[PDB]
Amino acid sequence: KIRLYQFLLDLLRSGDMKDSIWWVDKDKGTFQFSSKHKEALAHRWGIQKGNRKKMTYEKMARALRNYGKTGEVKKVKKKLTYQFSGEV
DNA sequence: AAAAAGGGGAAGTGGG
DNA sequence: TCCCACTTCCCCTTTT
């Protein structure tokens, strides 16, 4: 099944959900979530995953924080902004 | 102050 | 069975 980081990257590079997420610094791989619209993106993640419960941004960031352990995505010190590793 | 964002141990779930 | 990649819970610390 698809990985969360790909889900997010595929969205950035396609362009749907520009109300929910966008590139802060594309070349560098920095992307940011919208405060008011992040939930709609998080819910789509769950619908797609086929989770039995409803996906929230809180639970999605919980998973996101795990990539900081393996390096795929890291949190940047700006509100709702993360950064993909040399893979973006 | 108050609310949003950030955090993380640990048990639980689904697919392979 | 076990492993992985989250997912759910629940509650606490920091930034805005």
Domain extents for chain A? Answer: 1-88
Question: Is A62 marked as binding a ligand?
Answer: yes
Place of tokens 């405060």: A35
Task: Please provide the size of chain A in residues.
Answer: 88
Helix (H, G, I), strand (E, B) or coil at A67: helix
A23: DSSP letter: E
Q: What is the CATH number of domain A1-88?
A: 1.10.10.10
Q: Answer for the pair A61, A42: CB distance below 8 angstroms, yes or no.
A: no
Helix (H, G, I), strand (E, B) or coil at A81: strand
- CA A3 – C1' C6 distance (Å)? 9
A10's CB contacts (< 8 A; 6+ apart) are: none
CA A42, A50, A79: angle at the middle one, nearest 5? 15
A24, A3, A12, A14: which is closest to A82 by C-alpha?
Answer: A24
Q: Answer for the pair A17, A11: CB distance below 8 angstroms, yes or no.
A: yes
Question: Is A13 marked as binding a ligand?
Answer: no
C-alpha count within 13 angstroms, C-beta hemisphere, residue A80 = 15
**Experimental approach taken:** X-ray
What is the side-by-side order of every strand in the sheet holding A81-84?
Answer: A21-25, A30-33, A81-84, A73-75
**Nearest nucleotide (C1') to the CA of residue A64?**
C6
Question: Is A28 marked as binding a ligand?
Answer: no
Encoded amino acid at A14, one letter: S
- CA A14 – C1' C8 distance (Å)? 30
Helix (H, G, I), strand (E, B) or coil at A56: coil
- CA A6 – C1' C2 distance (Å)? 26
C-alpha count within 13 angstroms, C-beta hemisphere, residue A11 = 23
